[PDB]
């Protein structure tokens, strides 16, 4: 799956490989799978792009999970 | 139907030359391939030479290429094999061979009676 | 006749970014106001295309680049020339590049685009050469050293006549000519586009679609090709035909097409204005999946990641026993049809290749199994 | 020519009449894939490929899509989606001489099955086993070509037959080969059924302002419906609109 803020805003893209943990070709390991291109942060905001299992995803010129 | 007749050869002294003739009766000589085989007593069957009307004109064994010559005559319909610079090791029986295909897709090899070539030192 | 050109200069190959060039109309069907997804042999976006020059640097030990090598054709060629004096006189195509096999020659000698299909005996360094007469400033054909002989011509075509100038020009590059050559399904398809540019380096940012030019129904074996350039002989290059020559400044770019899926936007007024390469990056993959050139915020499922198989392994029993096929085929006594003889075949290795290739059997058919694959199947039991 | 070197000719830019061949009754086999012969006079094709050769009578059916055999694999293979016709007629009275005629040869051995519409002229020795040939025949090295035993007194099954395979290739390109038919004056603004250079349909034709660049022939809608066409003999662009219809 492709996490995108929309070409209306930017062109950066995150990639979510479902049910495949991060061993197959920054990098984050969610219960939904492996998320690449989105940086993990402690700070919690209102859900913007639902990913799964309580993780959502653009802020500060980057993609955050 | 298909018959091949071998003529020439025999016993010859050293330093001479020989000419063998394979005449085909029952079918024209112009076909896919006419082969010439040479075999000595105590030897197994092995390909020696062949002449084709398509693709490469003639093919020979590695140890015989470029030395002994062959030709065909459509007007008289016969294959001539000219052999020069004879050696005593040439004493063997020679055949001319053809391959025929019938209605049942069979591939049958038809031989001739052959000729004996002996060279005296 | 052929001049064996020597004294070449050594130079590593150069590369440049292909950007978003190489898009052509895949078919003759008119479309408008649509986004069409087509799978065809295209030039991928943002690739490296190989560079070749045509120049002779003035001064002591000046760089003398005459780039005329033999390049493979692969599965199509994008050939983009930046010019101001039309140095290139056409192209040649072939594999052995001799009279043994058929070859193709496209020549544009300022009169016609003449295409010939002949078993040309190509020179070691095929080319075309124009001798310059300074007194009257006239350029005329003087040397054609592309082939040493021409035989058994199978096809020849001539385009519309014209008269193009070969006089050298100074300043920025003004002509950009892009061509696409494909050799598929017995057809040689040549697509082209001409652009007036005002720049000295790289390819323009603008997007242009290469309209078809000719589709020759030739159908010839092609793996390699080579371009042709027109050199100049005059007082500035004293000597014989071997050394007394020069080539004006010009450049060309060679890229290789490959099977890709492209999303092409036929605008409202009938012309191709934009394209998206599906496999370039995940964003373009999403654009292709959504059939749109813009995507709103959200998560989209596009493809299915899978790890491909790496190697094949076969585990078969240790039993290398040949089956007794000759017990049945090489048999002189055969039973009646009502008393048909039955034999069981098991616990042996069976080679069906010899049975199929013996060619002694008038009728040989198979029901439920393809004959040519019998050599790769294992069976529980066989009844003869 | 021989079956392994079947002669291929291109047919284009001409009017063809297939009714004369069908009504000739001079061909033993007249069998078409993908086209009905009685309607061939109403079709237009981009190109025609004529592949002529001589084979044995018993193999007249051997040349067909999806079939297996030495001739199909190594001499002349037809594609699974072959479109065209196969024509065959006895040639014993014209191509067989007393004592047999062996001018026609067929390939028996090859490394791999030929791709459909592939011409093979190499006569290299086929290496059956692990023994190298190196231009020397013998065991595991046999000559792939075999003569045709075209004896005039032999059975009709083995009698020589001349075979011509016509491959009609049609694309979204201006047609070159067309049947006899006849060109009729077009009428616009009226619900008519039309046959434009092979493509048939029904609708109303209107003058259109859409740019057809010199290489298009017909434009289509989202579905496989010809929305616009380029008329031969006028090079004019006609919009095709479905005839008015509705519920009652
Ligand atoms: C350019 O190449 C062509 C093809 O060889 C030639 O010019 C034409 O040749 C055809 C013959 O095939 C004539 O019918 C045309 O009238 C020619 N066009 C001309 C002369 O303009 C010729 O070899 C070359 N032309 C020149 C001027 O060198
Ligand atoms: C151009 O020159 C090259 C030399 O690098 C030629 O290549 C060899 O030329 C010799 C002649 O002395 C011949 O044996 C062969 O043509 C080449 N050698 C080998 C081993 O094949 C090349 O042939 C020349 N080309 C022309 C058209 O003269
Ligand atoms: C013609 O098509 C065949 C189809 O595979 C190709 O054959 C190769 O030809 C090159 C050029 O001589 C050889 O180096 C390769 O070894 C050939 N490979 C095979 C498998 O035949 C190629 O596309 C064309 N070849 C020729 C000789 O024209
Ligand atoms: C989205 O596109 C519109 C143009 O349609 C533009 O005005 C706007 O700035 C873009 N971004 C946002 C966040 O609306
Ligand atoms: C990752 O996935 C594999 C296969 O699903 C699993 O065996 C493994 O325990 C998972 N975790 C790690 C850290 O590898
Ligand atoms: C939260 O922040 C601390 C330090 O700021 C860091 O060590 C920790 O890894 C962060 N949480 C996660 C889940 O990464
Ligand atoms: C193209 O050049 C080389 C291939 O020689 C390749 O490794 C490189 O990544 C490419 N670079 C660009 C700018 O296309
Ligand atoms: C120019 O002079 C050369 C002398 O070799 C001659 O061949 C050519 O035809 C002349 N051109 C014109 C236009 O007179
Ligand atoms: C040219 O034509 C024939 C077939 O048309 C080809 O096989 C042959 O090699 C050529 N003959 C020459 C070059 O003399
Ligand atoms: C739309 O196409 C017309 C050709 O009919 C041409 O003038 C131009 O490409 C477009 N029109 C305008 C006003 O730009
Ligand atoms: C039967 O014997 C013949 C020898 O004349 C041989 O050619 C053939 O291969 C044998 N059959 C089988 C199935 O091997
Ligand atoms: C056929 O139609 C075209 C298109 O109008 C015309 O140019 C040509 O002269 C016509 N041919 C004849 C023989 O009338």
Author numbering:
A (entry chain C): 596 to 620, 641 to 672, 687 to 694
B (entry chain Y): 1 to 121
C (entry chain C): 14 to 397
D (entry chain B): 348 to 595
Paper lines:
The virus exploits its trimeric spike (S) glycoprotein to adsorb to the host cell-surface receptor, angiotensin-converting enzyme 2 (ACE2), resulting in proteolytic processing and conformational changes required for membrane fusion and cell entry. Here, we take advantage of available sequences of five SARS-CoV-2 RBD–directed sybodies: Sb14, Sb15, Sb16, Sb45, and Sb68 (previously designated Sb#14, Sb#15, Sb#16, Sb#45, and Sb#68, respectively). Each of the sybodies represents an immunoglobulin variable-type fold consisting of two β-sheets packed as a β-barrel linked by a disulfide bond.
We also determined cryo-EM structures of Sb45 bound to the SARS-CoV-2 spike protein. To gain further insight into the interaction of Sb45 with the full S protein, we prepared complexes of Sb45 with HexaPro S (S-6P), a stable S variant containing six beneficial proline substitutions and acquired cryo-EM images as described in Experimental procedures. It seems that Sb45 can bind all the down positions of the RBD. In particular, Sb45-Z binds well to RBD-C with higher CC values, with additional contacts to the neighboring (up position) RBD-A. These variations in saturation of the available conformations by Sb45 reflect the mobility of the RBD. Sb16 and Sb45 may dock on all three RBDs in the trimeric S in any of the four configurations, without any apparent clash.
